[PDB]
Structures are given as C-alpha cells and as structure tokens.
C-alpha cells in the first residue's frame, strides 16, 4: 500500500491548517473586524457547526456523482479558494469594513464546505487503496491516520502562537500571515496529494446511490401500509417487501446501512459527554499547584497533554496491547473494543469526580498544643538575620532571611509555656536589636522587617484563621504610607487601611488574577499588580512607596497543606485518552469495514455526523450550567455509563456485514 504515502501527509498538512486557522479565528473576529462579542461567538459556533454538518454534502457527492479522488481534488480546490478569500480578507489596506467582511465570511463558508467533505472522503479513499484479502493492514492504516490527525493538532498548538504576535502585515497587527501560513501549507498539501494520481486504485462509483437509497427507503415506507386490505405487508424484515423492485443486490446494502445507522444512535450523547472536558477540567486545574519544581506549568497549557498522549499510546496500543490480547481466545470484534473504550471514558470521569472531592478538602495546617505558626517577611534594603529565642537566649528559631522577596513557607515554633514573651534577635547592618512581642499559643503570627532608617524594627501580626468559602480566597493588607488608603478589590465595600504600618481587616474576594485594583489615598490614585490569587489561601500584602522603585506590593501567603499538584490529573488524562484512542480508531475501521462496496464513504459521513450532533448537544447543554463541579462529574459519569449500557445492548444484537 505504498500509495497511502500521499494520503497521510495530506491529512497531516490539512488538519494542521484547519486547527491553525481555528485558534486565531476568535482573536481575528474580536480584534480585527472589531465585532460584538455575542455576534463573534455566534458566527464562530455557526462556522464550526457548518464544518461538522457538511460531510454529507461531501460523501453524497462522492458516492453518487463524480466518484472520489475526483471529489477530493475538486473539493480541496474549493477549500484552497476559501483559504485564498480568507487570507485576502485580512489585508488591512484595500477596502474597509465591507470588503474585509465579505471576503472573510465567504472564506469561512468555502473553508467549511471544503473540510466537511474532504474529511470523510479522504479516509474512505485511503481505505480503498487496500485489498479485501489484506483486510488486516487497513486497521494499521486507520491507526496511522488518527496519529497523523492528532500530530497535526499538536503541531498547530505549538506553532500558531508564533504567528499572530508582533508582525506588521500592513501598518497594523498582522493577521494575513496567521491565515496565509495555513492556506499555504494546505495548498502545498493539495500538490502532494495530486502526485499520487499514477499510484492510486480509483474506484468508479457504481450508481446514483444516495438517490437509489432514498428511493428504496421511500418505497419501503409504502408497502406495509395496507389500510383496508393486506395479507403480506412486508414479511420477515422491514425491507423484505421493498424488493419487488430495486434488485436485491442493493437491498442488502441498504439493510447494512440501516443497521449501522441504528447502531450509531446512542453515540452522539457520548461525543457530547467526552467533549465536556476541554474546559471543566481546566477549571479543575486552576485550583491546584503547578510549579513541579522544574517548569512552572500554566493551567491552560495542560490541554496540550491530550494529543501528546494520543501520539504516545497509538503506537503503544496497536503494537503491544492488541497483540498481547491476541495471546489467547480474547476476541475483540471491533465492537467490544468500542464498548470498553466507552467504559474507560466513564472510569475517567469518575476519577475526575474523585479528584474534585479530594481538592475540596484543603485546610491550612491547624495548630496543636505548644505550636505557633510563624512567617517572617523582610523589607530592609539589605539582608537580615532572624532569630527567635526564649528565657535566656534559648533556642526557638534561627533563620537567615534575604531582602525583598515573597514568602510562602512557615515553621512550627515549638513554644514552651502557656505564653512566652518572645525575645526577638534581629541583626542587620551590624546592629543589635531585641524586642518582645507577647504571643498566645496555637495561633498564626507574622513578622515585618522594615527599614527604620539606619536600624530596623519588628512588627508582629496575629492572623485569625477565618477560612474563605469554597472556590474563593481571603486577603488582608499592611500599609506603609503616610496617609490612609482605600483598596477596593470587592464591588461594594471600600476596604480601608491605616498609615505608618497599620493593619487592614480580612476581605474575602473571588479567586482569580487581579492585575490592577483601585487604590485611592488622600491625593493620588493608582493600581498594583496583585497577580494571581489562588483560593483557600490567605494573602497578606504590604504596600510600599520606596523612593527608588515607586509603588510596589510585596506578597505574603498562607498555604493549604494538602494542595494536590498539577499531577494526579494525568491519570484522568490517561484514562480519557485511552478511551479516545480505543474508540475513534476502532470506529473509523468499523465504519469502513462494515459498509457495502458501493457506499464506502456514507458510513464515514454517518460517523462524522455522530460527532457533529455531539457538538450540537455540547452547544445546547453548555448554557444550562448551575451545578457544582464534583456533582457535575458524577452526573457526567452516570450518564456516560447508561449510554455505554445502551450501546452495548444495541451492539450485542447487531448482525455483522458479510
């Protein structure tokens, strides 16, 4: 099957372009055409839905007229024209707001019409290259096909950010290249495909199949209807008397098509349920540690791990696990495989629910007897030497704290009595300063090292362990200015602070990233880069107005001990990607290998419409969201399980094509 060489490098290079032009599409709509947000999201979703529903207009026009490999060429040409009318509609010089809109919309329309009709037909054509005697090697071809698709997706994710940023196309931000590169690579794929015209095994279409199928099914739904008569409406099956016409060599084919269609009924719900992890799992990742000690991993980037697992399990599965199954009588009939894929998907969402139930158990470390939690913050310009001691210079704590930084650690200062007037030993700039802050046991305390001109002093702050509500954090502030401030993170209440090292009161603000907060003093208004604020974490911010560096806020955090890392989410990624690989590849092969020779691509159309109806269900359901995450995952697991049982029962009775 050497001629499949120019079938996989084409799918790679066109999925690459499609995923590249999808990611930048929303940014282009919002920031170039300057469209309203609801209009932009609406048109983007409409374009995706059109991409998903058009495969019928490709499969029918392949298996009825014009054949295929003459639909691939003559439809990828329209696809190229669509990319041209897109990249031409991003030119910022000629025309404005009417040309730029007309070309863009025509480009979306033609690109959708191309992709939805290249996607099924290319896989069907790749299948046809093989011989029925070599029925086994087709499975590896479809595995390689899916590998190429997800490799394209992966490379698009890694390389599209390097296109839409800081280029000049003509006097403004550069979106033509962000569209030109996908178009250029796709038209360079249309030339690698056409090179194989001397190599393929082009099957001529056998007849006006979709016309024949529709006419046959209509006549079928006419014979049983014997209103005031009848003795043999349609006996032993529901087509067997749609056979007085339409010779039987076709009636078997339409029977097979109907049986596979009846089998594919439950699947769209599964596609919707599996889809609802691209965003909700990211919300899960937002609420957990991610530094990893090697590379601080942003929660958004976690997504790219999904295609990577496909690239690492496809050659793992198809070359290890499937053979290891074949060691004995275990008979995967390419339907048990899809059922077990469904089962692993359900197990994956159950594991996600378990992870949720574990995350909501964060508590910051409570104190037992003779235990106070301390956390020293330094603001002296140089470096300071921190020591805490007892009655007689008796060891309680030694620690060298550096200059301006943040801090998240602490230390379990083993106190000694009901209350110990702590002797602090701070040494800085070769100075000896010792003050006493009487403290109560089993609490949390913080120090501020501040520049008292030549010398320094220690300020003690006692935290009251007011925990914040679920999925939300609490903050308090320390002021170092000469005037009282007002830092209103929240909507209604203007939080206030005090001058000359004052203390604020705890405020409970929504978790997230706060880049700038209103801060009005007696005279001046400004803002500060508070940055990220994880939930279940008590933050303390010190506001400084140092002469050299201006207004900057020095972080100081509490911490939940049992904060699970960004790991422990790979297991649910592993179990969902195993489901995806065991399901998609097997579905492609099953659709191709259980289809009559005259309609080899309408089954691919049925599979793609399954995915499309799944997307439509995703769209309709996603708006009706009012449930907690853990309950959401347990419901998505129970529903997926019942769908799996429905599919298993409806597959145990599916007679195979022969």
């Amino acid at each position: 099957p050497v001629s499949i060489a120019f079938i996989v490098v084409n799918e790679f290079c066109e999925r690459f372009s499609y995923y590249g032009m999808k990611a930048v599409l929303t940014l282009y709509f919002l920031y170039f055409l300057h469209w309203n947000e609801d209009t932009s999201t609406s048109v983007y979703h409409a374009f995706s839905s059109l991409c998903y529903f058009t495969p019928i207009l490709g499969a029918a026009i392949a298996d009825s007229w014009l054949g295929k490999f003459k639909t691939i060429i003559y439809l990828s040409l329209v696809y190229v024209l669509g990319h041209v009318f897109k990249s031409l509609g991003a030119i910022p010089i000629l025309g404005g707001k009417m040309l730029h809109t007309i070309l863009s919309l025509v480009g979306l329309s033609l690109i959708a019409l191309g992709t939805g009709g290249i996607k099924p037909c290319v896989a069907a054509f790749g299948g046809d290259q093989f011989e029925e005697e070599h029925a086994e090697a087709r499975t590896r071809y479809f595995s390689v096909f899916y590998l190429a698709i997800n490799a394209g997706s992966l490379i698009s994710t890694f390389i599209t950010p390097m296109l839409r940023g800081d280029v000049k196309c003509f006097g403004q931000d550069c979106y033509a290249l962000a569209f030109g590169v996908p178009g250029l690579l796709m038209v360079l794929a249309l030339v690698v495909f056409a090179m194989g015209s001397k190599m393929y095994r082009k099957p001529p279409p056998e007849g006006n199949i979709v016309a024949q199928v529709i006419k046959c099914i209509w006549f079928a739904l006419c014979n049983r209807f014997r209103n005031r008569s009848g003795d043999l409406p349609k006996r032993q099956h529901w087509l067997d008397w749609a056979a007085e016409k339409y010779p039987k060599h076709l009636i078997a084919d339409v029977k097979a098509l109907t049986r596979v269609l009846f089998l594919y009924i439950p699947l769209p719900m599964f596609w919707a349920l599996l889809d609802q992890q691209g965003s909700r799992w990211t919300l899960q990742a937002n609420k957990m540690n991610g530094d990893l000690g090697f590379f601080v991993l942003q929660p958004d980037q976690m997504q790219v791990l999904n295609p990577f697992l496909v690239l690492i399990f496809i050659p793992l599965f198809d070359l290890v696990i499937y053979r290891l199954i074949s060691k004995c009588r275990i008979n995967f009939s390419s339907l048990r495989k899809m059922a077990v894929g469904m089962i692993l998907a359900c197990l994956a969402f159950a594991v996600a629910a378990l992870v949720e139930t574990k995350i909501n158990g964060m508590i910051h470390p409570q104190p037992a007897s003779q235990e106070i939690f301390l956390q020293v913050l330094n603001l002296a310009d140089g470096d300071v030497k921190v020591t805490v001691l007892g009655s007689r210079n008796n060891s309680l704590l030694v620690e060298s704290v550096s200059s301006f930084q943040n801090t998240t650690h602490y230390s379990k200062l083993h106190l000694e009595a009901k209350s110990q007037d702590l002797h602090f030993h701070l040494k800085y700039n070769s100075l000896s300063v010792h003050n006493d802050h009487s403290v109560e046991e089993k609490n949390c305390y913080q120090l501020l090292i501040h520049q008292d001109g030549e010398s320094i002093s220690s300020m003690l702050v006692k935290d009251t362990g007011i925990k914040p509500a679920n999925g939300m954090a609490a903050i308090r502030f320390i002021n170092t200015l000469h005037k009282d401030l007002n830092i209103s993170l929240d909507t209604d209440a203007p939080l206030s602070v005090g001058k000359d090292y004052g203390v604020s009161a705890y405020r409970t603000v929504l978790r997230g990233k706060y880049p700038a907060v209103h801060c009005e003093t007696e005279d001046k208004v400004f803002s500060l880069d508070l940055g990220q604020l994880d939930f279940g974490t008590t933050y303390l911010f010190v506001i400084t107005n140092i002469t050299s560096q201006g207004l900057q806020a020095w972080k100081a955090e509490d911490i939940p001990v049992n904060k699970l890392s960004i790991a422990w989410q790979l297991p649910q990624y592993v179990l969902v990607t195993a489901a995806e690989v065991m399901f998609s590849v097997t579905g492609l092969e099953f659709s191709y290998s259980q289809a009559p020779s005259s309609m080899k691509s309408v089954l691919q159309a049925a599979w793609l419409l399954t995915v499309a109806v799944g997307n439509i269900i995703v769209l309709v359901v996603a708006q009706f969201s009012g449930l907690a995450q853990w309950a959401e995952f347990v419901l998505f697991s129970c529903l997926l399980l019942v769908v799996c049982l429905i599919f298993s029962v409806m597959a145990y009775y599916y007679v195979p094509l022969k």
Epitope: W35, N36, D38, T39
Partner: nanobody, 123 residues
Framework: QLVESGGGLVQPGGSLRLLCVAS????????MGWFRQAPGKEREFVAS????????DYSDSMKGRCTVSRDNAKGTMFLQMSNLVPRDTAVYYC????????????????????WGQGTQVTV
C-alpha cells in the same frame, strides 16, 4: 439606559478611575464602551468592554495604560488610565449598546446607541 459619569482634574503624570452606572435597566444586557472628545472637532474611541467583561479592547493610543472593567451587580463600569499626560484633556463620554447581532465595528461612533453625558477630565 440613562447612564452617568464621575472623574476629575489630574497632575501631569497621575492617573484616574472613571465610573459609569446604569440607572434604569439591567446593566447585564448592555455592551459598553468609552469615548473621548477633545475640545476640537474629533470623537475618538477610547476603550471597549464586552458583555460579561470577558472581552476588552483598547484604542491604539490607550494613553499610557488603560483598564476597563464592569460588575454586572450594581451595574457600573470602571476606566483606569495610568499615565495621563497634558494631552487627552477631553470630555470622556460613556456609551452603551444593547446586545444585538450586528457587524458594525465595536470601536466606532456608530455601534453605540445611548451615550450619556461626559466628565471634563483635564491634566
């Protein structure tokens, strides 16, 4: 609808926060934008925040730094300039537009329908 406005004089290098409340209808259903008008013959788009505040866009100038935000509760929108200079002494207008399906640009004096009075921020 019936929008309002609050803000004032500045030092040559200070900053401000502009406030705009909705006085007669649910502020959630309103796309929102900021305009200026120098004491000349212009009407410059300044910044724009979309419904739910999820998408924000700033003009090419966006003097120093600007940040728009909105809380659909209490129905108010916040503009925060950073580096006001002796330019942009203008009459900053606050503009609103209902959530329709239109292809009109979000950064023009055409999409917004009901801009109210404006402050007289000087520098």
């Amino acid at each position: 609808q019936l929008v309002e406005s609050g803000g004032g004089l500045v030092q040559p290098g200070g900053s401000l926060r502009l406030l705009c409340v909705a006085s007669g209808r649910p502020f959630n259903d309103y796309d929102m934008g900021w305009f200026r008008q120098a004491p000349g013959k212009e009407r410059e788009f300044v910044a724009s925040i979309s419904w739910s505040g999820r998408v924000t866009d700033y003009s090419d100038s966006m003097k120093g730094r600007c940040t728009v935000s909105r809380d659909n509760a209490k129905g108010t929108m916040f503009l925060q300039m950073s580096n006001l200079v002796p330019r942009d002494t203008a009459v900053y207008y606050c503009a609103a537009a209902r959530r329709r399906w239109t292809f009109k640009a979000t950064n023009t004096e055409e999409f917004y329908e009901t801009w109210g009075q404006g402050t007289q921020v000087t520098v």
